[PDB]
Amino acid sequence: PANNTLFIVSISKTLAANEPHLTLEFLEECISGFSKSSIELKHLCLEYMTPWLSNLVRFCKHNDDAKRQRVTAILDKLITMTINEKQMYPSIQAKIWGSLGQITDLLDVVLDSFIKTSATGGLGSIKAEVMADTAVALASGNVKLVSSKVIGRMCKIIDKTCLSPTPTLEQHLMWDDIAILARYMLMLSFNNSLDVAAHLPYLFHVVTFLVATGPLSLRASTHGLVINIIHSLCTCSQLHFSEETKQVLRLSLTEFSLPKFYLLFGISKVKSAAVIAFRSERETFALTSLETVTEALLEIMEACMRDIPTCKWLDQWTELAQRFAFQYNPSLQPRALVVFGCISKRVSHGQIKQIIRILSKALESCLKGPDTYNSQVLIEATVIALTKLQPLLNKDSPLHKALFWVAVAVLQLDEVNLYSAGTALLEQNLHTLDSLRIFNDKSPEEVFMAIRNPLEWH
Amino acid sequence: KTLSIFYQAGTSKAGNPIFYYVARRFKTGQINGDLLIYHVLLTLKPYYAKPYEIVVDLTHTGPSNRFKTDFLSKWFVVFPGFAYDNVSAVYIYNCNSWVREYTKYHERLLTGLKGSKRLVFIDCPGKLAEHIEHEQQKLPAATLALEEDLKVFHNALKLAHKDTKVSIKVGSTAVQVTSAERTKVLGQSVFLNDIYYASEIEEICLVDENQFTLTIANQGTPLTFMHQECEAIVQSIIHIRTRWELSQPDTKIRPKDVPGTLLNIALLNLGSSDPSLRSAAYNLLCALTCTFNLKIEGQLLETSGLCIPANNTLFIVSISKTLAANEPHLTLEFLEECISGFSKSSIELKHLCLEYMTPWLSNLVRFCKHNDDAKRQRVTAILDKLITMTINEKQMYPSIQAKIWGSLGQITDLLDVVLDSFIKTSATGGLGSIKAEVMADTAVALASGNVKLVSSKVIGRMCKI
Amino acid sequence: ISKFFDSQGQVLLTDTNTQFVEQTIAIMKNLLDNHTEGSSEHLGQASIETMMLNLVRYVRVLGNMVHAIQIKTKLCQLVEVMMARRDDLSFCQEMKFRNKMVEYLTDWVMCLTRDLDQASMEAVVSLLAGLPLQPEEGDGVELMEAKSQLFLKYFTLFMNLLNDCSEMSRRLASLRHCTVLAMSNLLNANVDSGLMHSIGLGYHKDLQTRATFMEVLTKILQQGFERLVELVTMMGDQGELPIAMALANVVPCSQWDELARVLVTLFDSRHLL
């Protein structure tokens, strides 16, 4: 007959399940003929190679490295085939890639091949675009494993940016790497295809770290990532929330949809985030906008953990804030300080004056170097993390009244942002000192000078 | 036309003029409601200065005859207080389930009538003769004709969330389900009587020996009744059905009863290559599964400004395969107009279309041979159109005859009609025509599901010639 | 203006009456443009209802020339401005009034002519908002079938207007924007004559015309939760009613007699009078 398609498939699926020892030569041979056949004949090719993919798992990891890199060559050739065929593209995503990711324990080499392939393409290339597209169809076989590998892989890179610090983070050597793999999270963030029920505190950390960064497309992509995170958090059934928490999440979606949060995330001119996000000189960042965004995400995350018993979201989230909060890296030190100010529920006595140490060291670099604006900015952030942290401080230390002189010394500097940050510090300092009722006993002009008198010379 | 809706007619036993309001003649709307309330204002004006009584003929009062809430609120304010206080009695004839649900939805506006002695519910037509003389009765002739020549089946049970004892009166134009036990309407224990005219009875189904199903137009929920003589009720309703559509007529589409068309417009545009289309289609599918109450594996939500991936094909398939297994009642129109949208789409979308319609094709076996010839002819239309797309699309041919024809041959009992379609479509082309040749080629892919039946049927149909 | 019609609707078309019309267009526009200083006496007597039919039946015969096309454009803004102030005015009946404006405008809407196109199509959009279509000459035919045929008549007209649009940039963007609002208006207005003719738009060749049309198919689907709006958006609890004095100090006095109704209608239902 003119067709043999069911017959050819019924042969080709018998041998693959019957004997697996010749899969490699067959898969290497078949892709070349797939590349040089007529299109209607090409439709047969994947139709009869799809059983051969499922037993490729035993060839990997079995400790023969030549065949293991042959597996990598096969995968990369499938990448080339996936890129080249646009008209036949839903079929190749439906047949081979879902079947590939559906079997566990192949995932590491496929993700590794994806990242090294997308690295050569670069951000804004066709290759990394369609590759982040293909990762969606990949991830549905195992949601948690693909999600955990992507998030952990990206968390390690943000951790390792501290070795060779540059202040901008658009200047650092692996900026394009972070941008490329952030596009993966944007693509993959649709229907809880990254598991928000276990990876939420890691995910908000990256969200806080990369707001309002880079070109317009990535800036809108961060916003769309936040919307999809909250939406999948609402629609997730494993969490089984109460009604009131679902209500406040439903209001929070409309909150983040507002044009005010368009201004906060840096997309002011653009009407629709999704239009600019899928299409393929920067305005300065305001740190108080990051403070408001972190407060909103804190409110959402606390409302979520009200239902869940002993979730420990805040513990991991504060540690992941704190570790970046106490290093040198100027791209990541002020943002982590503001985050650790906003989130934390506990303060150590040495910790608050280690923040003071950070202030003292940061004031030196802007003094000897009139070259970087950011050397001032850290000091501003070092002010802000003071203001939230002082009400949390325990029984009456001299630091309660010493922060008044800290605020005065900040006010003595002539910069606008430092002045505005010091005023809020002095306001919360007066309010907390009034709440602790020291001011009932004494006038302000004696209790503050009581600390000033031992330090009178300086 | 508004003069026959509300009119002054007759004088009761108590010496009060009677005003008849025929609710079924009223159609809900702005100018119809305004003309109605102005006609009531003009006709009532000589007589609300005196004690008067009102007969409300609520036969066949449905969603076309409701008062809107702004209009219903007007009836308690635009007339003076002595107009309401001079109403000696309100004779409410033929209260039904719709009127009961309407009064339950408007308990706040109708609290002046709740518990009122002035409401006399006419649960039996002889009771209205207890306050109005028969010569003074001027109910419409259709209302009196609904009482005559009724084939009454007592001691039936309307099965529902609450199963109610009813009696089924089948007349030559209508079906009346009269409640045999009283229910609470406006604080009064009354006997309900639903009326279904000629134009509403769509499907007449005999489920078993003591249950039948009646389907009402523009009403999604079927009616089911249990009775000792259900087959007699079924044949009588089929008799009057055959009476009215073969006498009175010797395509009107509502927004409700097209679920397959909207579902396919959602699904085909959901994988499209534009984020705005893709965003809006997701909200439309979420609204569509919200209204019609059909099962999804996961929950949904409608939010503007989502960012949806450029491919959706596994998600789209995981939706369109879940509905086909969960509810099969809408496969026909979906498969009918899905092929048209396949025919006028670009090729990359055309690859999506068969990929997501192949689970829906697996359950039209039950819609064959089920003794209704209209749907069995509709199936033949679908299969002819499948033949047309198999002819016209030479390029995609191994994929389609691997996907849909092998799936067709996998299931039993559909083999006859696909072979008759092959024969009568082979006869039109003639030998040497491509129409005969490539469809004869697809017969091979058909036969691979079940060998013996296709072999026996081909050889038998050949030997008879 | 009723003097200008000679016999059985024969329009005289004199230059003096044309100049008088050109004056009275600006007069009616400037009168209806004001929103203040007392709207209770804007009721009048058969308000502008007989006026506009006479006005359009005068200007339709005026022909195609520069002053004539200018007067036609000015009338097209005037209809829109009047349609803005619907709630102030008072007709005895307006549905077959509105339908006659649609008939007397759509017939002649289709270098300054393309300016008049987006001058007039906006007025059609304003007129079609919420309007139930009805056959004015309902005699001689069934009313619902004539309604469906009239829907097809107005619907194919917007189809081949959008198709002529789809074949310089900003005015074509204005057509392709304004036409689908008209589509949405006459589909959302009535559906039982609409859907069976209009469901074929979902597979349109222009993608941008699809989703917004398809957006309408969402809304109708839930055409057939405000208690929290009455709760936290209306009362403003835990304060000395700040939003109440806000709406007191913002809303003009001409709707105060409405406003004085709508506050206490709520709060006695929630027992905080």
Tab-separated table of C-alpha atoms in Angstrom, chain A residues 85-293:
chain	number	residue	atom	x	y	z
A	85	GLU	CA	11.082	23.756	11.950
A	86	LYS	CA	8.562	26.499	12.607
A	87	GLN	CA	5.636	25.109	10.615
A	88	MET	CA	5.868	21.714	12.310
A	89	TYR	CA	6.724	23.170	15.733
A	90	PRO	CA	3.640	22.195	17.849
A	91	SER	CA	4.035	18.600	16.703
A	92	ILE	CA	7.673	18.300	17.750
A	93	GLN	CA	6.924	19.919	21.080
A	94	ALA	CA	3.976	17.602	21.645
A	95	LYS	CA	5.619	14.350	20.614
A	96	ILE	CA	9.270	14.162	21.592
A	97	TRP	CA	9.899	16.810	24.247
A	98	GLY	CA	7.026	15.896	26.547
A	99	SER	CA	7.933	12.242	26.147
A	100	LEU	CA	11.550	13.139	26.864
A	101	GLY	CA	10.829	15.003	30.073
A	102	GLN	CA	8.156	12.549	31.141
A	103	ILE	CA	10.775	9.975	32.128
A	104	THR	CA	12.668	10.983	35.271
A	105	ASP	CA	16.503	11.164	35.617
A	106	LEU	CA	17.261	12.500	32.138
A	107	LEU	CA	16.461	16.007	33.292
A	108	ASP	CA	19.895	17.224	34.396
A	109	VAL	CA	21.662	16.696	31.073
A	110	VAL	CA	18.743	18.149	29.109
A	111	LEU	CA	18.639	21.292	31.265
A	112	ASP	CA	22.426	21.510	31.076
A	113	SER	CA	22.319	21.261	27.288
A	114	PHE	CA	19.561	23.867	27.246
A	115	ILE	CA	21.568	26.373	29.256
A	116	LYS	CA	24.789	25.869	27.274
A	117	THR	CA	22.831	26.138	24.031
A	118	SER	CA	21.072	29.324	25.129
A	119	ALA	CA	24.372	30.773	26.347
A	120	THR	CA	25.814	30.779	22.828
A	121	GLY	CA	22.642	32.361	21.485
A	122	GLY	CA	22.598	35.270	23.885
A	123	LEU	CA	19.650	37.253	25.179
A	124	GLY	CA	17.360	38.555	22.460
A	125	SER	CA	18.376	35.837	20.001
A	126	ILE	CA	15.875	33.519	18.345
A	127	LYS	CA	17.564	30.454	19.836
A	128	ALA	CA	17.246	31.277	23.537
A	129	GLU	CA	13.715	32.564	22.892
A	130	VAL	CA	12.451	29.317	21.375
A	131	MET	CA	14.476	27.385	23.916
A	132	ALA	CA	12.817	29.059	26.881
A	133	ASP	CA	9.615	28.354	24.973
A	134	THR	CA	10.490	24.648	24.748
A	135	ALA	CA	11.269	24.477	28.471
A	136	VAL	CA	7.541	24.958	29.166
A	137	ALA	CA	6.627	21.760	27.339
A	138	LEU	CA	9.589	20.103	29.024
A	139	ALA	CA	8.585	20.966	32.561
A	140	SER	CA	5.108	19.426	32.553
A	141	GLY	CA	6.427	15.883	32.922
A	142	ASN	CA	8.039	16.677	36.274
A	143	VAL	CA	7.117	20.071	37.692
A	144	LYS	CA	9.097	19.948	40.921
A	145	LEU	CA	12.374	18.632	39.519
A	146	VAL	CA	12.633	21.115	36.640
A	147	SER	CA	11.529	23.926	38.954
A	148	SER	CA	14.012	23.010	41.686
A	149	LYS	CA	16.905	22.618	39.264
A	150	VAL	CA	16.195	25.953	37.550
A	151	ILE	CA	15.800	27.828	40.837
A	152	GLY	CA	18.824	26.252	42.539
A	153	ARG	CA	21.004	26.735	39.456
A	154	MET	CA	20.064	30.397	39.282
A	155	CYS	CA	20.466	30.893	43.023
A	156	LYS	CA	24.053	29.637	42.821
A	157	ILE	CA	24.898	32.194	40.118
A	158	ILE	CA	23.526	35.124	42.129
A	159	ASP	CA	25.549	33.757	45.042
A	160	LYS	CA	28.730	33.575	42.957
A	161	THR	CA	28.418	37.139	41.619
A	162	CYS	CA	30.044	38.330	44.873
A	163	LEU	CA	33.496	37.051	43.847
A	164	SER	CA	34.209	39.810	41.296
A	165	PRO	CA	31.898	42.638	42.356
A	166	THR	CA	30.782	45.409	40.024
A	167	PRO	CA	28.276	47.994	41.298
A	168	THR	CA	25.807	48.133	38.411
A	169	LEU	CA	24.968	44.364	37.995
A	170	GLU	CA	24.368	45.163	34.318
A	171	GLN	CA	28.167	45.413	34.171
A	172	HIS	CA	28.938	42.062	35.798
A	173	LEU	CA	30.207	39.220	33.623
A	174	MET	CA	27.213	36.890	34.068
A	175	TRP	CA	24.466	39.486	33.604
A	176	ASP	CA	23.400	37.988	30.270
A	177	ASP	CA	23.316	34.589	31.967
A	178	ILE	CA	20.896	35.808	34.655
A	179	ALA	CA	18.758	37.592	32.045
A	180	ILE	CA	18.576	34.512	29.822
A	181	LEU	CA	17.604	32.208	32.634
A	182	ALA	CA	15.133	34.775	34.009
A	183	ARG	CA	13.324	34.501	30.685
A	184	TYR	CA	13.025	30.774	31.513
A	185	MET	CA	11.137	31.592	34.699
A	186	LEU	CA	8.895	34.016	32.822
A	187	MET	CA	7.992	31.322	30.285
A	188	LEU	CA	7.711	28.589	32.871
A	189	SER	CA	5.724	30.524	35.453
A	190	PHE	CA	2.258	29.974	34.019
A	191	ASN	CA	0.176	27.305	35.757
A	192	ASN	CA	2.258	26.456	38.826
A	193	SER	CA	4.741	24.921	36.407
A	194	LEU	CA	7.319	25.988	38.913
A	195	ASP	CA	6.220	24.688	42.285
A	196	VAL	CA	5.241	27.707	44.354
A	197	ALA	CA	4.119	25.448	47.211
A	198	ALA	CA	7.748	24.742	48.127
A	199	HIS	CA	9.931	27.277	46.287
A	200	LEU	CA	8.140	30.482	47.306
A	201	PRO	CA	10.758	32.137	49.631
A	202	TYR	CA	13.557	31.518	47.140
A	203	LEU	CA	11.362	32.925	44.399
A	204	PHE	CA	10.474	36.190	46.132
A	205	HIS	CA	14.175	36.674	46.867
A	206	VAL	CA	15.028	36.732	43.181
A	207	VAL	CA	11.981	38.909	42.549
A	208	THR	CA	13.249	41.438	45.107
A	209	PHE	CA	16.759	41.274	43.714
A	210	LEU	CA	15.955	41.989	40.073
A	211	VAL	CA	13.139	44.565	39.976
A	212	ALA	CA	13.635	47.502	37.599
A	213	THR	CA	16.861	46.140	36.120
A	214	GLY	CA	18.019	46.006	32.524
A	215	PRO	CA	16.044	46.784	29.371
A	216	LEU	CA	12.311	47.377	29.157
A	217	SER	CA	11.412	43.806	28.164
A	218	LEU	CA	13.048	42.252	31.218
A	219	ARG	CA	11.547	44.938	33.447
A	220	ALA	CA	8.067	44.043	32.225
A	221	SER	CA	8.920	40.347	32.466
A	222	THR	CA	9.619	40.704	36.179
A	223	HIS	CA	6.163	42.236	36.626
A	224	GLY	CA	4.498	39.476	34.632
A	225	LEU	CA	6.431	36.957	36.701
A	226	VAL	CA	4.995	38.487	39.882
A	227	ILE	CA	1.437	38.418	38.491
A	228	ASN	CA	1.740	34.792	37.416
A	229	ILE	CA	3.282	33.868	40.786
A	230	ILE	CA	0.322	35.299	42.686
A	231	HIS	CA	-2.154	33.818	40.198
A	232	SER	CA	-0.729	30.304	40.465
A	233	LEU	CA	-0.521	30.774	44.227
A	234	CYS	CA	-4.249	31.485	44.176
A	235	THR	CA	-5.131	28.615	41.854
A	236	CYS	CA	-2.964	26.014	43.591
A	237	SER	CA	-5.065	23.260	45.128
A	238	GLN	CA	-2.410	21.547	47.253
A	239	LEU	CA	-2.265	24.471	49.669
A	240	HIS	CA	-6.077	24.368	50.347
A	241	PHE	CA	-6.324	27.901	51.710
A	242	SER	CA	-9.131	29.442	53.706
A	243	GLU	CA	-11.568	31.808	52.028
A	244	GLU	CA	-10.266	35.074	53.521
A	245	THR	CA	-6.703	34.404	52.362
A	246	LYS	CA	-7.982	33.682	48.848
A	247	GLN	CA	-9.911	36.950	49.014
A	248	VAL	CA	-6.866	38.998	49.990
A	249	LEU	CA	-4.809	37.339	47.241
A	250	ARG	CA	-7.575	38.175	44.766
A	251	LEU	CA	-7.419	41.793	45.870
A	252	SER	CA	-3.617	41.681	45.701
A	253	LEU	CA	-3.727	40.711	42.023
A	254	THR	CA	-5.740	43.839	41.280
A	255	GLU	CA	-3.327	45.779	43.495
A	256	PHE	CA	-0.349	44.713	41.408
A	257	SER	CA	-2.305	45.376	38.216
A	258	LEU	CA	-2.475	49.095	39.078
A	259	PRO	CA	-0.495	51.800	37.226
A	260	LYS	CA	1.170	52.714	40.532
A	261	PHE	CA	2.930	49.366	40.542
A	262	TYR	CA	3.678	49.936	36.861
A	263	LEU	CA	5.583	52.986	38.070
A	264	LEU	CA	7.222	50.987	40.880
A	265	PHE	CA	8.440	48.250	38.540
A	266	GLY	CA	9.780	50.826	36.087
A	267	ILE	CA	7.241	50.422	33.276
A	268	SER	CA	5.720	53.885	33.046
A	269	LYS	CA	5.381	54.594	29.329
A	270	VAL	CA	4.201	51.121	28.351
A	271	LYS	CA	0.483	50.372	28.581
A	272	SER	CA	0.602	46.557	28.575
A	273	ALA	CA	3.331	44.396	30.094
A	274	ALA	CA	2.484	41.272	28.109
A	275	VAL	CA	2.755	43.031	24.743
A	276	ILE	CA	6.272	44.344	25.344
A	277	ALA	CA	7.308	41.174	27.193
A	278	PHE	CA	6.900	38.955	24.116
A	279	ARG	CA	7.911	41.351	21.337
A	280	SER	CA	11.470	40.191	20.616
A	281	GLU	CA	18.798	54.978	28.609
A	282	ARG	CA	17.227	53.423	31.694
A	283	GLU	CA	15.466	55.527	34.314
A	284	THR	CA	17.094	55.467	37.747
A	285	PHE	CA	15.941	53.240	40.568
A	286	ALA	CA	14.213	54.502	43.705
A	287	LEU	CA	14.968	52.461	46.801
A	288	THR	CA	11.764	53.409	48.636
A	289	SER	CA	9.871	51.810	45.756
A	290	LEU	CA	11.696	48.582	46.616
A	291	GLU	CA	10.653	49.129	50.234
A	292	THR	CA	6.973	49.375	49.243
A	293	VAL	CA	7.170	46.310	46.982
